[PDB]
Design an enzyme around this catalytic site. Structure first.
Site, PDB file in Angstrom:
ATOM      1  N   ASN A 175     -63.577 -15.268 -14.732  1.00  0.00           N
ATOM      2  CA  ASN A 175     -64.007 -13.911 -14.539  1.00  0.00           C
ATOM      3  C   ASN A 175     -63.267 -13.162 -15.609  1.00  0.00           C
ATOM      4  O   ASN A 175     -62.057 -12.977 -15.500  1.00  0.00           O
ATOM      5  CB  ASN A 175     -63.517 -13.449 -13.188  1.00  0.00           C
ATOM      6  CG  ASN A 175     -63.845 -12.045 -12.974  1.00  0.00           C
ATOM      7  OD1 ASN A 175     -64.044 -11.321 -13.946  1.00  0.00           O
ATOM      8  ND2 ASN A 175     -63.800 -11.606 -11.746  1.00  0.00           N
ATOM      9  N   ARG A 230     -56.281  -0.837  -4.771  1.00  0.00           N
ATOM     10  CA  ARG A 230     -56.765   0.431  -5.287  1.00  0.00           C
ATOM     11  C   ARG A 230     -57.101   1.376  -4.141  1.00  0.00           C
ATOM     12  O   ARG A 230     -56.203   1.986  -3.564  1.00  0.00           O
ATOM     13  CB  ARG A 230     -57.940   0.238  -6.254  1.00  0.00           C
ATOM     14  CG  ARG A 230     -57.524   0.512  -7.683  1.00  0.00           C
ATOM     15  CD  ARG A 230     -58.654   0.673  -8.668  1.00  0.00           C
ATOM     16  NE  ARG A 230     -59.295   1.989  -8.606  1.00  0.00           N
ATOM     17  CZ  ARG A 230     -60.468   2.259  -9.180  1.00  0.00           C
ATOM     18  NH1 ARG A 230     -61.097   1.295  -9.845  1.00  0.00           N
ATOM     19  NH2 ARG A 230     -61.024   3.468  -9.087  1.00  0.00           N
ATOM     20  N   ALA A 243     -63.098  -7.150 -18.204  1.00  0.00           N
ATOM     21  CA  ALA A 243     -63.489  -6.338 -19.355  1.00  0.00           C
ATOM     22  C   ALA A 243     -63.730  -7.133 -20.632  1.00  0.00           C
ATOM     23  O   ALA A 243     -64.564  -6.731 -21.485  1.00  0.00           O
ATOM     24  CB  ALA A 243     -62.453  -5.332 -19.574  1.00  0.00           C
ATOM     25  N   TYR A 261     -63.188   0.096  -2.804  1.00  0.00           N
ATOM     26  CA  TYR A 261     -63.014  -1.252  -3.320  1.00  0.00           C
ATOM     27  C   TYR A 261     -62.615  -2.134  -2.128  1.00  0.00           C
ATOM     28  O   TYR A 261     -62.234  -1.621  -1.066  1.00  0.00           O
ATOM     29  CB  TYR A 261     -62.011  -1.209  -4.482  1.00  0.00           C
ATOM     30  CG  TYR A 261     -62.569  -0.295  -5.560  1.00  0.00           C
ATOM     31  CD1 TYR A 261     -63.618  -0.725  -6.379  1.00  0.00           C
ATOM     32  CD2 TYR A 261     -62.137   1.023  -5.685  1.00  0.00           C
ATOM     33  CE1 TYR A 261     -64.189   0.109  -7.321  1.00  0.00           C
ATOM     34  CE2 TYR A 261     -62.697   1.867  -6.633  1.00  0.00           C
ATOM     35  CZ  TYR A 261     -63.723   1.408  -7.444  1.00  0.00           C
ATOM     36  OH  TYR A 261     -64.269   2.260  -8.381  1.00  0.00           O
ATOM     37  N   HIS A 276     -68.463 -12.491 -11.747  1.00  0.00           N
ATOM     38  CA  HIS A 276     -68.152 -11.052 -11.635  1.00  0.00           C
ATOM     39  C   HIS A 276     -68.300 -10.622 -10.176  1.00  0.00           C
ATOM     40  O   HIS A 276     -69.296 -10.926  -9.518  1.00  0.00           O
ATOM     41  CB  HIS A 276     -69.103 -10.224 -12.468  1.00  0.00           C
ATOM     42  CG  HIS A 276     -69.084 -10.604 -13.908  1.00  0.00           C
ATOM     43  ND1 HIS A 276     -68.125 -10.134 -14.773  1.00  0.00           N
ATOM     44  CD2 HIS A 276     -69.875 -11.428 -14.635  1.00  0.00           C
ATOM     45  CE1 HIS A 276     -68.325 -10.658 -15.969  1.00  0.00           C
ATOM     46  NE2 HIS A 276     -69.373 -11.455 -15.912  1.00  0.00           N
ATOM     47  N   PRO A 294     -58.307  -9.249 -17.481  1.00  0.00           N
ATOM     48  CA  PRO A 294     -57.532  -8.032 -17.311  1.00  0.00           C
ATOM     49  C   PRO A 294     -57.881  -7.091 -16.185  1.00  0.00           C
ATOM     50  O   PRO A 294     -59.047  -6.778 -15.982  1.00  0.00           O
ATOM     51  CB  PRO A 294     -57.722  -7.296 -18.648  1.00  0.00           C
ATOM     52  CG  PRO A 294     -59.020  -7.814 -19.191  1.00  0.00           C
ATOM     53  CD  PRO A 294     -59.013  -9.288 -18.774  1.00  0.00           C
ATOM     54  N   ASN A 295     -56.812  -6.619 -15.541  1.00  0.00           N
ATOM     55  CA  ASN A 295     -56.821  -5.586 -14.495  1.00  0.00           C
ATOM     56  C   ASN A 295     -57.054  -6.199 -13.138  1.00  0.00           C
ATOM     57  O   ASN A 295     -56.990  -5.498 -12.128  1.00  0.00           O
ATOM     58  CB  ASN A 295     -57.818  -4.441 -14.762  1.00  0.00           C
ATOM     59  CG  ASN A 295     -57.539  -3.701 -16.073  1.00  0.00           C
ATOM     60  OD1 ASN A 295     -56.526  -2.980 -16.221  1.00  0.00           O
ATOM     61  ND2 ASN A 295     -58.466  -3.809 -16.997  1.00  0.00           N
ATOM     62  N   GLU A 316     -69.177 -18.383 -14.890  1.00  0.00           N
ATOM     63  CA  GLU A 316     -68.675 -17.030 -15.068  1.00  0.00           C
ATOM     64  C   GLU A 316     -68.866 -16.295 -13.748  1.00  0.00           C
ATOM     65  O   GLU A 316     -69.976 -16.315 -13.238  1.00  0.00           O
ATOM     66  CB  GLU A 316     -69.488 -16.351 -16.195  1.00  0.00           C
ATOM     67  CG  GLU A 316     -69.075 -14.961 -16.537  1.00  0.00           C
ATOM     68  CD  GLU A 316     -69.875 -14.309 -17.656  1.00  0.00           C
ATOM     69  OE1 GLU A 316     -70.876 -14.920 -18.104  1.00  0.00           O
ATOM     70  OE2 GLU A 316     -69.508 -13.166 -18.052  1.00  0.00           O
ATOM     71  N   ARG A 324     -74.129  -1.254 -13.338  1.00  0.00           N
ATOM     72  CA  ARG A 324     -73.164  -0.309 -13.861  1.00  0.00           C
ATOM     73  C   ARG A 324     -73.617   0.201 -15.217  1.00  0.00           C
ATOM     74  O   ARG A 324     -74.797   0.123 -15.494  1.00  0.00           O
ATOM     75  CB  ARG A 324     -71.798  -0.970 -13.917  1.00  0.00           C
ATOM     76  CG  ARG A 324     -71.398  -1.511 -12.532  1.00  0.00           C
ATOM     77  CD  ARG A 324     -70.062  -2.164 -12.469  1.00  0.00           C
ATOM     78  NE  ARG A 324     -68.982  -1.236 -12.754  1.00  0.00           N
ATOM     79  CZ  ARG A 324     -67.733  -1.617 -12.969  1.00  0.00           C
ATOM     80  NH1 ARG A 324     -67.422  -2.909 -12.886  1.00  0.00           N
ATOM     81  NH2 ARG A 324     -66.805  -0.708 -13.257  1.00  0.00           N
TER      82      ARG A 324
END
Lengths: 149, 149, 149, 149, 149, 149, 149, 149, 149, 149, 149, 149
Positions: free
Chosen positions: F78, F22, F81, F27, F105, F14-15, F103, F112
């Site tokens: 990936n 953005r 969230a 970013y 990211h 998601p996102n 995986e 974070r």
């Protein structure tokens, strides 16, 4: 400092001297020498060089990080067990303002004991590569290449 | 590697060089030399020998473990303060496949501060002896004797 | 042993060698040498001397603490990162019976990351001085002066 | 009360009556009877005797500790499960002022589940031996022999 | 504001009014008046003055901090019990933009109960001095004198 | 089974449809389209193909995981969230016995917020790459190639 | 059931049979026989009687609670170590609908080890009295008298 | 100071001015004036007197403890909310060396919200009485009586 | 052992002897005798029998578990309060290699206090049935019949 | 009490006197006086009045809550720091049976330090408004108007 | 309302569609189709019917719960992974006033990873059945049948 | 975008479709249609419009959040159960740079179960309104008006 100007520092933490000399069955077969060659190759492709070292001593790694700081184009580091205990190592990397750092772990620490899930190094490292075998070091080399240039 | 083939390694962590030289009243009167002799004696009863060392440096203890791994028949270890902080000593002991290991603590760490209650070394050690005085080194020797034979 | 008999040991932990050579803007401009000069001056005002040292190694800090225990009138120590990790340096300090010890942090550790909020050294230290700059070392020397006399 | 004056109480917690009668392969082959013999032998070497008991009831172990208090020279105890749950037996041992008490666990509880990592008995035990197999009861008897004389 | 322009506010929390009068009679212990006299001399050495106050009441301390914000050159604060409980006192110190603040504890709070290990004032205070005795107040005045000029 | 036989599933949580749209400044500037293109190329070098997909729905990601299970030679994922909340996607991956998973990211989740420090997917992924930018997808692909062949 | 109708059950957990027979100096001189006599006198003053009992067994304590529930006008309990470990006693007390229960501890458990700070009995007891000495058992009796009438 | 010498101070914490004025149905019907009358009665019986006070201010309770410290024979205190938040009142009570203190709560705080389970006052108070109703204050007076003589 | 060879052991922990005798309104009306009848009938539908027992004693429940291990075809156990505290009943059940075990709770423990959410028995029991009333005992027997055959 | 019968009490905790007087840039420009005016206007629109107060003292805010309970139709409260520390304010609001209470916080506490994320006040307050600036007091008055009407 | 009026809703969360198609060796052989058949059979025996469904989507599951709320006599649910993460599914079950609900887990979640020990559904479910295999679904239907009638 | 230029998006999470249709007595009588009316009404007074939506699907809320990001002037959102669980709704809101967001909860979440105390959405929301009933959505619309203009 660029790739062409200076070498990439590759640091390896404690016990990694014994890589591939344990249970060639449960653990890999590659040795720290095989790993270094993987790096030289990888760096060469991008016209760069490496400076590959290993130590079991917290303070000596601190010293190498200071050297890197003034004389190297980035750091690929596998802090091994010092990943989970050494604030010292983390502080030394904090002094390398502007320097690309990639942290690498051979195994997926996230599948191991809970005390290994946390790494002081990972709050300073730009990237963290875990469980990609010795191939993670090549990934680490390539990432420096990209960042350094 | 047997008790008759090779010595037993007896490693001693930080601060134990000062054993018995503090407050001969609240702490014992026995010295590291007294402990070494307790070990030489207990091993001689089983026809074996010891190789007795002390260090304040974590990485040096790691190096000594790697040594034992190829050259000794067991390890008696009093990690002292590194017991509670040293993932590196734990990983070192983990490369010693099939090698008997006994942890010794002079004092009863379970009666002291909470940070002392956990040892990284105890998750690899076959046996852990704590609070039996310097006598626990003789126990550690006896146990290595029974496992190695 | 008095301020007139023996010197004050001032010990500095890892990374302090780079003091003032980082971001002279965000970080101060005083070097380790400036600090040592400041301590000598404050000790001299009391008719005392200082023995000023720095090391990236945990074990070497312990050895220096053993020395002080027999040869110095007190300790002023900035353990840096080892404050948070080193049970070994605390147990070294714990052998210094009756000796004065003052811990100094240049920055206010209580405003930084939660893992810097705890110091193992602070449970042995008579006094703790944090976030008073390099001036905190002068306060250290004056405290030792007052405790030693 | 001395070793030549009175017996050593060897107390055994719940489930230990089945010692060695489970899986002779994964678990040992020694029985509670083989352990008693080991105990009797060790104590005869120092001119002492043992009183060896086992029960599944917390309250009955409390009753036997009160007895020891008036009739025995010390206690070797393997509380088994009650190590982790019984304040009652901690409190019973606490009434045994100046009595030597040694805690034994056949297996190394530090490698088992987290709830087995703490023992209430360890805060009163003079010493604790874990992971040394049935030989640990031997060590127990030896330690008591040294403390009681 | 300079030391020349305005006094240093020295604030003392609850119970400090009883400093040095707990029984029986330890000769030569310092009272709150003694500390005020030490403070007056410390500031005079730098040409400055002090406004020394003490309160049992959280709210009054807040009022006095508001006062200092507009009328004083800096704050030396021994919040006593309120160090551990008063967000209100921190929030007041936070309104004092630019103003120097040093927190002083006579005793080493890090060697006492766990609840006394955290201070809310410490996240605002520029510097924290603990367990340097009543001499810590003089260190607090000196630090203000250096931050003020 | 292999790279030449079947494609690699690349899954985006998601996102990630908003990647690079953005703040082209804080970013990156690369889009999912770009990333997909990066993946196609890396795959092609090893003679394989990719099947690149994205979704905001937890269940859709499960469904897609089951499809890869029977028709793909590995997975690069990936989870965005859903890394920190989704036990269902973990369980989906767990059905993919013997299938290589990596995986990715983009950002260094360890730098974070604390709730992002844990990832459910990490205990199934063979490897985990974090904070190497879009470049990490390529790593994911190169690793799948190695594990697959 | 009233005070004139049936006795007050007074129950005493483990190790309390040993009251006053430990260190007449550090611990009281009062015996459980002294306590019983204080209870009789108190209950008599209000025209009542008592049924005073002690046991080291959890289950026997549950048995007597079940008896009280049908034959007594109230319970004063000092559960000793069982306060902190016994859900079973709490459940027993729970079946005594409407019956007045007072819990009594001789010492102030709040000043002891942290594990004695919590009491299962205290969520059911109408009243908890701690650190009032043996006089607390009289407080217990008087509260029952007032609760039963 | 004895009971015949000086009064027992009875301190009451915040919100207790509204006792018995709330929901005479769910809360009692007795008021602070009724509790005072009980205390006068209980004290007279032992030839003593009381000084009965209530405040909603933390600081004023600390002032009054200081007053008791010099002028009264003991303290009975119901700190109400301040039980759970006030280090300052704990610290006041700590200056009253050798002075008897009893803590009283009307309701059984151990059946309420977890944050009411801990009382700072309980680490100094000689005795704690809780959930005995207003009669608890009579218990407190009786405890002081016995402690003062 | 088959259902035709030996009875199913049905064990019930503390306080269950009072089942149905409490508040025939809030609590059920079924007694432990009713429950036993329900169990005979369930077993009989499968050609089997039951051996139904209740005890308030930890150690007796252990003895009976040791008995079942050698004489019974399975265990149905409602441990009551001992589910939350008894590492000993858990260890007893662990010696029952290959014996079917089902745990039953009449009430849904997950809707009660947090101390009731964890059961030691549940880590050994093959299945756990909670909140299905006494019918849950029937389910227990049915599961044992299925696993037994 | 309706809005026509009595004013709404608007209570402001510690430090709010300085509202708008700090950094007119980072913090607002609105003062406590501006806020009162917003509140007077909002209450008039609904045909009521307000009684607007601010204090730095916990126990005064307590006194004012008692007053409001007798004299006012509701309470709109900004407890500031005391939100996170005062069980005493909470106990005061709890005596206000049937009276509407709205908690207001100008800033979004959920985005600041973790100790700010909990409010004792929020557990009695009918509604809680945070991060809506001074406008949040307008919502407060509106919510009281809807509840008191 | 009744079993004769309306069907029992049986819902199954994510990955359950793969039931029995994984490792027919380590995992069962029964498919979701086999389970639906057991449920039909068991309901028919009580003259009822079932409406058996499965979904990987949290939100779809919520929609089906809303449906059952008005059209079904009870719910039997295996939430799979959503048990441990779905507040939404808990909240949907909470709208189903008086409706019977029985949660069923195929494996004994209590023996797996600690994050599987907790289920949001168990705080609403009337009963919870775990580790009874697919037979647990039959117990669920029986419980519903007993509760519906 | 302005209120005049674009609508305010009002998003409603799972289960709110049943608002006012449960227990008209314990829960309100207002329905989502009524809340929607109060929103249209409040926006109209400021010259704006709304776009009112409700969904049970996390990923659908995220899609709608992306939509608002490009076409709406603010978001008011009641995430319902997903407040506590959805990192994906949080991340969606974080992509909405500069857009006013207000969270609304009808009930006071701080008064319910602990797992309800924390909302992921509160760390991005400008304001959060809780326990103000459906009126809270009005406050939310006004705050959006005040921030958008």
């Amino acid at each position: 400092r660029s790739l062409a100007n200076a070498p990439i520092m590759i640091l390896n933490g404690p016990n990694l001297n014994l890589l591939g000399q344990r249970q060639p069955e449960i653990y890999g077969s590659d040795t720290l020498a095989d790993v270094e060659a993987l790096c030289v190759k990888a760096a060469a492709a991008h016209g760069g060089t490496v400076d590959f070292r290993q130590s079991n001593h917290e303070g000596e790694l601190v010293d190498w990080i200071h050297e890197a700081r003034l004389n190297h184009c980035g750091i690929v580091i596998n802090p091994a067990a010092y990943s989970h205990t050494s604030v010292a190592i983390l502080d030394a990397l904090n002094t390398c303002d502007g320097l690309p750092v990639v942290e690498v772990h051979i195994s997926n620490i996230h599948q191991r004991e809970p005390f290994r899930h946390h790494s002081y190094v990972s709050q300073r490292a730009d990237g963290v590569v875990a469980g990609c075998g010795v191939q993670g070091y090549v990934f680490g080399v390539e990432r420096i290449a990209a960042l350094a240039g």
